[PDB]
Every structure is written in C-alpha cells, then in structure tokens.
Amino acid sequence: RPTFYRQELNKTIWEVPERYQNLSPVGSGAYGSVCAAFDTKTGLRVAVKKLSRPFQSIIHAKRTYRELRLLKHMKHENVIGLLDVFTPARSLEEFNDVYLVTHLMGADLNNIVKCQKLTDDHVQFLIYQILRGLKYIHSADIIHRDLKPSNLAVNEDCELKILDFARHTDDEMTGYVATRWYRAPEIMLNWMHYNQTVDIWSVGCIMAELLTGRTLFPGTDHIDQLKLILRLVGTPGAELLKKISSESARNYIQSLTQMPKMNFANVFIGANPLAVDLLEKMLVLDSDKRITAAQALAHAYFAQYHDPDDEPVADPYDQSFESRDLLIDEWKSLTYDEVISFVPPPL
Numbered sequence: 001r002p003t004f005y006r007q008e009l010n011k012t013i014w015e016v017p018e019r020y021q022n023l024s025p026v027g028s029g030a031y032g033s034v035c036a037a038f039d040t041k042t043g044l045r046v047a048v049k050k051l052s053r054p055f056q057s058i059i060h061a062k063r064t065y066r067e068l069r070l071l072k073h074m075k076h077e078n079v080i081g082l083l084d085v086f087t088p089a090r091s092l093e094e095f096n097d098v099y100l101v102t103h104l105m106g107a108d109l110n111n112i113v114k115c116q117k118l119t120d121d122h123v124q125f126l127i128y129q130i131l132r133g134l135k136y137i138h139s140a141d142i143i144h145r146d147l148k149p150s151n152l153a154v155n156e157d158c159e160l161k162i163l164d165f166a167r168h169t170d171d172e173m174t175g176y177v178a179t180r181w182y183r184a185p186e187i188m189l190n191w192m193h194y195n196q197t198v199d200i201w202s203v204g205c206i207m208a209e210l211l212t213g214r215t216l217f218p219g220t221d222h223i224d225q226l227k228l229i230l231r232l233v234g235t236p237g238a239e240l241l242k243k244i245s246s247e248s249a250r251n252y253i254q255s256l257t258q259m260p261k262m263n264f265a266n267v268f269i270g271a272n273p274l275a276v277d278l279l280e281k282m283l284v285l286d287s288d289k290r291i292t293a294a295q296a297l298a299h300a301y302f303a304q305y306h307d308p309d310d311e312p313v314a315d316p317y318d319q320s321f322e323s324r325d326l327l328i329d330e331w332k333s334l335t336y337d338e339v340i341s342f343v344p345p346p347l
C-alpha cells in the first residue's frame, strides 16, 4: 500500500498517494471534482478526479463501475485512458471513495473556439482526431451519446482526447441539461433505437461551429432544436417519415410547413468546400444514410492526415454488465475488484 496524505481543497477533501503533489482544483460537477497534480513517479502532469457520491444509488454504483470499466479499456491516443486508480480504503468494508488519474488536458474545445477563430488546418486536425477516437470507441460497440465541445479535451499541442464516453436514460435530476445543441435529431425525437451515427451528427455540429464561430443549432428546447435542424436540412422525405413509429411525432413533423434542404455552400460561405462536403455527409437527417467514423476518416478533407494503418480499432469490450440488475453492494464489490486489479500502463 502506498503512503497517502490528506488535504481539503475548496469544499472537497482529498486523500491521495504521496506521488501526486501540488493538487490545484480545475473544476467540479455532477461527475466528480478534478484537480491538476504533478505525478512524481513519471514526471507527468495529471488530472485526478474524485468521484462524487459513487455509491449513492444503484444508478451511481453502476455508473461508477461503468466509468472504471470504460477507462480501463480505452487505450487510444484520442480517448482518455487510465494512468491510475486508487482508494484510500484498506478493505471493502471501508470502501467509499474512488479516484481516477489521467494525463492533464488544460483546455477544451470551447476555450479554443471562443478565444480564437481556428484556421482550416486546425479544424482538419481536430476533427480528424475526434473521428479517429470515435472509430475506436464505435468499434467496441460503444456509443458516446453526448459529444460536445466541453467533452473534447485539447492541450497546447492541439492534441485532442474524447472524455465522458458514461450515462443512459436515467431517473435522476443531477447533471440535467436543458437543450442540447449537439444532439442528433432522432434523440430529440426520443427514438429508442438510434445508432452509433448519433455521434457523427454531433461531430458535424462541432465542426460547423469551429468553421463559423457560431453554434449551428442553438435551440431553447427539444422542439425548438428540431425546428432549427429542419430549417437547415429541410423537412423529412417520404423514406424517413416512414421510419417514425411514434404517431404523434410523425404527425407533428408532417403538420409543419414543409421546408427544403438549404445549399450548404450558401450557409457555410467562406469555408473549404471539402469541409462543406463532409459536413453535408455528417448532417444527414436519416441516420441510416449518415456517414460513419471510418468512412469519414477516408474523406478527402483529411488527406493530409489519413492513414488506414494508424487508425486502430479496439479489443473486444464486455458490456454484458449493462443488462445486470444488481444491489448497490454488489456494484461496490465489483468496482473494488477493478480498483485492486488495475495494472498501470508501462511508463
């Protein structure tokens, strides 16, 4: 067992191994609290996240296990992975807190887009990285489901990592988001059978914003969001309308004054046409015809970066736990096993 030390930061107390020094708070939320620290063992600057109320409910307990399982599995340059995980608990009985450690990423895509107007080269590189990470995530039968600028970490070298790839249709009001500018329309329609391309829709929205400096669809509610979307891409054709089982949703859409698809060249005026072509393949209303991450990587917009030999897929990921209905103490025990069995990556 390593030697731990205690300290209080803001209103959050922290108990971590001595290897981590100079903890300074970076921010907190529904997820947990995060501190930047210096890892004396590796010489790296790391981010240390203390989970918030990990075993409050079966929802938190299962989510704590899920995040740990996800982070332990993700080994890819464009996806956050685990440098370390620890608890000050000496045994299961006193197991109450989980701390996760990863490489420190000093900014997110919001800081980047707001503080400066990115060049086309930057847009290509950043979007390239997101897609390369999504290709990997998606290959493990994982859907991010909430991609947005504040979920994309970026460092001073313009290297990018996807974070938060750990929620589902939950019965809690913590972390509730009012309207989501980056969400696929099928999600705004509460479709229960969406596919991995919901993430591609988000990339499209993010990419648009990096090119124009404006949120593409700043809707105030789910319906306002959907109307802004249909204004750009036009109202659904016969083929897509036929895929809507929800009688009320289908009928509402059909009762809207019908709208044509806008010419993307007029909307994203001044943008690299290759960029506009890709945007158009990403922002397809029918998810069945939306481009995949793997296909997008091979789009001519990324010719400067695309390398099939260096766009890997993930090892098989066991999500069978997702269907389990267990007691809080069972999820806690499983999580504890995962902490104790963690093998750090080679330096």
Ligand SMILES: c1ccc(-c2nnc(N3CCN(c4ncccn4)CC3)cc2-c2ccncc2)cc1
Pocket (backbone or CB within 6 Å): 003, 018, 019, 020, 021, 040, 041
């Ligand atoms: C790997 C990484 C870090 C460590 C480490 N472990 N314990 C450390 N001590 C623990 C005890 N030490 C102490 N002990 C008694 C009185 C006053 N101070 C304070 C700092 C420092 C350190 C430490 C080492 C290197 N740089 C900074 C801190 C051990 C292995």
Ligand SMILES: c1ccc(-c2nnc(N3CCN(c4ncccn4)CC3)cc2-c2ccncc2)cc1
Pocket (backbone or CB within 6 Å): 026, 027, 029, 031, 034, 047, 048, 049, 080, 100, 101, 102, 103, 104, 105, 106, 150, 151, 153, 163, 164
């Ligand atoms: C291990 C250690 C830290 C993390 C980590 N977790 N969450 C992070 N974000 C910070 C804020 N982000 C956010 N903020 C506002 C709205 C929606 N999301 C959500 C969570 C950043 C980070 C983070 C921060 C800095 N560097 C790397 C990762 C994950 C695993």
Ligand SMILES: Fc1ccc(-c2n[nH]cc2-c2ccncc2)cc1
Pocket (backbone or CB within 6 Å): 185, 186, 189, 191, 236, 240, 243, 244, 245, 246, 253, 285, 286, 287, 288
């Ligand atoms: F107005 C819209 C917006 C999006 C969709 C949509 N795109 N892909 C799948 C769907 C969809 C929506 C609702 N139910 C089934 C499928 C359908 C209608």
Ligand SMILES: [Cl-]
Pocket (backbone or CB within 6 Å): 134, 135, 138, 196, 197, 292, 293, 294
């Ligand atoms: Cl995909």
Ligand SMILES: [Zn+2]
Pocket (backbone or CB within 6 Å): 059, 060, 172, 173, 174
């Ligand atoms: Zn909760």
